[PDB]
Amino acid sequence: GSSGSSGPEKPAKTQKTSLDEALQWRDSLDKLLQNNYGLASFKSFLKSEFSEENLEFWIACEDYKKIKSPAKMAEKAKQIYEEFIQTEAPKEVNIDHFTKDITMKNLVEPSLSSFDMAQKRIHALMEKDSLPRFVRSEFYQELISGPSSG
């Protein structure tokens, strides 16, 4: 018999982003969000431009797609709407009545692609609005013209 006690551990490190990569974010916004590095930075950028609500709707969407629960898939759906797709909502994203209306009609029998349009709608804005406005900012200049060469 020997008394023993376990203990926690420490994480590790790894690459982040390369020059030939940072540029890939220019072509399609997705590449950016997908990349942990580009994403983290992308967010902050918005927070300053009071346009962080645009990304939020995106992150949530994905977090909703991975919803198997028969109640959550529906209930949760209304949540995102009452937050963004809600009248004068606090984070009401930028979506004309056209797209906005869509989601609503998709709140009846929502499953996974409930916010298919709304998602692609905002995503297309953060890629043609912020994306192009993020590269011009320093946050980007440091990603490509940082402590490394181009």
PDB file of N, CA and C in Angstrom, residues 11-54:
ATOM      1  N   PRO A  11       0.251  22.909 -21.006  1.00  0.00           N
ATOM      2  CA  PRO A  11      -0.013  22.811 -22.445  1.00  0.00           C
ATOM      3  C   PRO A  11       1.264  22.886 -23.274  1.00  0.00           C
ATOM      4  N   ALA A  12       1.106  22.925 -24.594  1.00  0.00           N
ATOM      5  CA  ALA A  12       2.247  23.000 -25.497  1.00  0.00           C
ATOM      6  C   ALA A  12       2.096  24.159 -26.476  1.00  0.00           C
ATOM      7  N   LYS A  13       3.074  24.309 -27.364  1.00  0.00           N
ATOM      8  CA  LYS A  13       3.051  25.377 -28.355  1.00  0.00           C
ATOM      9  C   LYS A  13       3.160  24.813 -29.767  1.00  0.00           C
ATOM     10  N   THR A  14       2.978  25.676 -30.762  1.00  0.00           N
ATOM     11  CA  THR A  14       3.056  25.263 -32.157  1.00  0.00           C
ATOM     12  C   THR A  14       2.938  26.460 -33.092  1.00  0.00           C
ATOM     13  N   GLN A  15       3.133  26.217 -34.386  1.00  0.00           N
ATOM     14  CA  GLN A  15       3.047  27.277 -35.383  1.00  0.00           C
ATOM     15  C   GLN A  15       1.799  28.127 -35.169  1.00  0.00           C
ATOM     16  N   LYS A  16       1.719  29.241 -35.888  1.00  0.00           N
ATOM     17  CA  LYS A  16       0.575  30.141 -35.780  1.00  0.00           C
ATOM     18  C   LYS A  16       0.043  30.514 -37.159  1.00  0.00           C
ATOM     19  N   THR A  17       0.822  31.302 -37.896  1.00  0.00           N
ATOM     20  CA  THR A  17       0.429  31.730 -39.232  1.00  0.00           C
ATOM     21  C   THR A  17       1.643  32.144 -40.056  1.00  0.00           C
ATOM     22  N   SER A  18       1.617  31.818 -41.344  1.00  0.00           N
ATOM     23  CA  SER A  18       2.718  32.153 -42.241  1.00  0.00           C
ATOM     24  C   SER A  18       2.310  33.257 -43.212  1.00  0.00           C
ATOM     25  N   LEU A  19       3.303  33.888 -43.829  1.00  0.00           N
ATOM     26  CA  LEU A  19       3.051  34.963 -44.782  1.00  0.00           C
ATOM     27  C   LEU A  19       2.101  34.502 -45.884  1.00  0.00           C
ATOM     28  N   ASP A  20       2.488  33.442 -46.586  1.00  0.00           N
ATOM     29  CA  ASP A  20       1.670  32.900 -47.665  1.00  0.00           C
ATOM     30  C   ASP A  20       0.263  32.578 -47.169  1.00  0.00           C
ATOM     31  N   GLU A  21       0.096  32.557 -45.850  1.00  0.00           N
ATOM     32  CA  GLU A  21      -1.198  32.259 -45.250  1.00  0.00           C
ATOM     33  C   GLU A  21      -1.996  33.539 -45.012  1.00  0.00           C
ATOM     34  N   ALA A  22      -1.419  34.450 -44.235  1.00  0.00           N
ATOM     35  CA  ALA A  22      -2.074  35.716 -43.930  1.00  0.00           C
ATOM     36  C   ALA A  22      -2.760  36.293 -45.164  1.00  0.00           C
ATOM     37  N   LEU A  23      -2.164  36.058 -46.329  1.00  0.00           N
ATOM     38  CA  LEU A  23      -2.717  36.553 -47.585  1.00  0.00           C
ATOM     39  C   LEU A  23      -3.966  35.768 -47.978  1.00  0.00           C
ATOM     40  N   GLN A  24      -3.946  34.466 -47.711  1.00  0.00           N
ATOM     41  CA  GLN A  24      -5.077  33.604 -48.037  1.00  0.00           C
ATOM     42  C   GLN A  24      -6.365  34.142 -47.422  1.00  0.00           C
ATOM     43  N   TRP A  25      -6.224  34.946 -46.375  1.00  0.00           N
ATOM     44  CA  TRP A  25      -7.378  35.526 -45.697  1.00  0.00           C
ATOM     45  C   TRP A  25      -8.018  36.617 -46.549  1.00  0.00           C
ATOM     46  N   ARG A  26      -7.233  37.195 -47.450  1.00  0.00           N
ATOM     47  CA  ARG A  26      -7.724  38.252 -48.326  1.00  0.00           C
ATOM     48  C   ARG A  26      -8.721  37.700 -49.339  1.00  0.00           C
ATOM     49  N   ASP A  27      -8.405  36.538 -49.901  1.00  0.00           N
ATOM     50  CA  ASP A  27      -9.274  35.901 -50.885  1.00  0.00           C
ATOM     51  C   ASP A  27     -10.649  35.616 -50.290  1.00  0.00           C
ATOM     52  N   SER A  28     -10.674  34.829 -49.220  1.00  0.00           N
ATOM     53  CA  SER A  28     -11.925  34.474 -48.560  1.00  0.00           C
ATOM     54  C   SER A  28     -11.833  34.714 -47.055  1.00  0.00           C
ATOM     55  N   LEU A  29     -12.850  35.368 -46.504  1.00  0.00           N
ATOM     56  CA  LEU A  29     -12.885  35.661 -45.075  1.00  0.00           C
ATOM     57  C   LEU A  29     -12.789  34.380 -44.252  1.00  0.00           C
ATOM     58  N   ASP A  30     -13.506  33.349 -44.688  1.00  0.00           N
ATOM     59  CA  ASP A  30     -13.499  32.067 -43.996  1.00  0.00           C
ATOM     60  C   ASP A  30     -12.098  31.724 -43.499  1.00  0.00           C
ATOM     61  N   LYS A  31     -11.159  31.605 -44.430  1.00  0.00           N
ATOM     62  CA  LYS A  31      -9.779  31.281 -44.088  1.00  0.00           C
ATOM     63  C   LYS A  31      -9.350  32.000 -42.811  1.00  0.00           C
ATOM     64  N   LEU A  32      -9.745  33.262 -42.688  1.00  0.00           N
ATOM     65  CA  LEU A  32      -9.404  34.059 -41.514  1.00  0.00           C
ATOM     66  C   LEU A  32     -10.046  33.480 -40.258  1.00  0.00           C
ATOM     67  N   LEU A  33     -11.373  33.529 -40.201  1.00  0.00           N
ATOM     68  CA  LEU A  33     -12.108  33.007 -39.055  1.00  0.00           C
ATOM     69  C   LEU A  33     -11.609  31.618 -38.674  1.00  0.00           C
ATOM     70  N   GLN A  34     -11.473  30.749 -39.670  1.00  0.00           N
ATOM     71  CA  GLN A  34     -11.002  29.389 -39.438  1.00  0.00           C
ATOM     72  C   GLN A  34      -9.687  29.392 -38.666  1.00  0.00           C
ATOM     73  N   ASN A  35      -8.769  30.262 -39.075  1.00  0.00           N
ATOM     74  CA  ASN A  35      -7.469  30.365 -38.422  1.00  0.00           C
ATOM     75  C   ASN A  35      -7.602  31.002 -37.043  1.00  0.00           C
ATOM     76  N   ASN A  36      -7.138  30.290 -36.020  1.00  0.00           N
ATOM     77  CA  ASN A  36      -7.205  30.787 -34.651  1.00  0.00           C
ATOM     78  C   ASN A  36      -6.533  32.152 -34.533  1.00  0.00           C
ATOM     79  N   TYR A  37      -5.357  32.280 -35.138  1.00  0.00           N
ATOM     80  CA  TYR A  37      -4.610  33.532 -35.099  1.00  0.00           C
ATOM     81  C   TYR A  37      -5.400  34.657 -35.761  1.00  0.00           C
ATOM     82  N   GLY A  38      -5.744  34.464 -37.030  1.00  0.00           N
ATOM     83  CA  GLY A  38      -6.497  35.470 -37.756  1.00  0.00           C
ATOM     84  C   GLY A  38      -7.804  35.820 -37.075  1.00  0.00           C
ATOM     85  N   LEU A  39      -8.485  34.808 -36.549  1.00  0.00           N
ATOM     86  CA  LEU A  39      -9.758  35.014 -35.866  1.00  0.00           C
ATOM     87  C   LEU A  39      -9.586  35.922 -34.654  1.00  0.00           C
ATOM     88  N   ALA A  40      -8.795  35.466 -33.688  1.00  0.00           N
ATOM     89  CA  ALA A  40      -8.543  36.239 -32.478  1.00  0.00           C
ATOM     90  C   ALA A  40      -8.325  37.714 -32.805  1.00  0.00           C
ATOM     91  N   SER A  41      -7.435  37.979 -33.755  1.00  0.00           N
ATOM     92  CA  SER A  41      -7.131  39.348 -34.156  1.00  0.00           C
ATOM     93  C   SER A  41      -8.333  39.993 -34.839  1.00  0.00           C
ATOM     94  N   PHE A  42      -8.961  39.251 -35.746  1.00  0.00           N
ATOM     95  CA  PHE A  42     -10.123  39.750 -36.471  1.00  0.00           C
ATOM     96  C   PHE A  42     -11.174  40.291 -35.507  1.00  0.00           C
ATOM     97  N   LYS A  43     -11.447  39.532 -34.451  1.00  0.00           N
ATOM     98  CA  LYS A  43     -12.431  39.932 -33.452  1.00  0.00           C
ATOM     99  C   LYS A  43     -12.110  41.316 -32.897  1.00  0.00           C
ATOM    100  N   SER A  44     -10.973  41.427 -32.217  1.00  0.00           N
ATOM    101  CA  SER A  44     -10.552  42.695 -31.634  1.00  0.00           C
ATOM    102  C   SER A  44     -10.827  43.851 -32.590  1.00  0.00           C
ATOM    103  N   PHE A  45     -10.406  43.689 -33.841  1.00  0.00           N
ATOM    104  CA  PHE A  45     -10.606  44.720 -34.853  1.00  0.00           C
ATOM    105  C   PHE A  45     -12.043  45.231 -34.833  1.00  0.00           C
ATOM    106  N   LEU A  46     -12.994  44.305 -34.857  1.00  0.00           N
ATOM    107  CA  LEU A  46     -14.409  44.660 -34.842  1.00  0.00           C
ATOM    108  C   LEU A  46     -14.774  45.393 -33.555  1.00  0.00           C
ATOM    109  N   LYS A  47     -14.445  44.783 -32.420  1.00  0.00           N
ATOM    110  CA  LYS A  47     -14.733  45.378 -31.121  1.00  0.00           C
ATOM    111  C   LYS A  47     -14.478  46.882 -31.142  1.00  0.00           C
ATOM    112  N   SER A  48     -13.416  47.287 -31.829  1.00  0.00           N
ATOM    113  CA  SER A  48     -13.063  48.699 -31.926  1.00  0.00           C
ATOM    114  C   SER A  48     -14.007  49.434 -32.871  1.00  0.00           C
ATOM    115  N   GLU A  49     -14.373  48.772 -33.964  1.00  0.00           N
ATOM    116  CA  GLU A  49     -15.272  49.362 -34.949  1.00  0.00           C
ATOM    117  C   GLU A  49     -16.731  49.115 -34.571  1.00  0.00           C
ATOM    118  N   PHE A  50     -16.960  48.788 -33.303  1.00  0.00           N
ATOM    119  CA  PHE A  50     -18.308  48.524 -32.813  1.00  0.00           C
ATOM    120  C   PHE A  50     -19.067  47.614 -33.774  1.00  0.00           C
ATOM    121  N   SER A  51     -18.329  46.775 -34.493  1.00  0.00           N
ATOM    122  CA  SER A  51     -18.931  45.855 -35.451  1.00  0.00           C
ATOM    123  C   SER A  51     -18.662  44.406 -35.054  1.00  0.00           C
ATOM    124  N   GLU A  52     -18.448  44.182 -33.763  1.00  0.00           N
ATOM    125  CA  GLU A  52     -18.179  42.843 -33.255  1.00  0.00           C
ATOM    126  C   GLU A  52     -19.427  41.970 -33.332  1.00  0.00           C
ATOM    127  N   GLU A  53     -20.586  42.613 -33.444  1.00  0.00           N
ATOM    128  CA  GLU A  53     -21.852  41.896 -33.526  1.00  0.00           C
ATOM    129  C   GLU A  53     -21.937  41.087 -34.817  1.00  0.00           C
ATOM    130  N   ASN A  54     -21.207  41.530 -35.835  1.00  0.00           N
ATOM    131  CA  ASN A  54     -21.199  40.847 -37.125  1.00  0.00           C
ATOM    132  C   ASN A  54     -20.605  39.448 -36.996  1.00  0.00           C
TER     133      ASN A  54
END
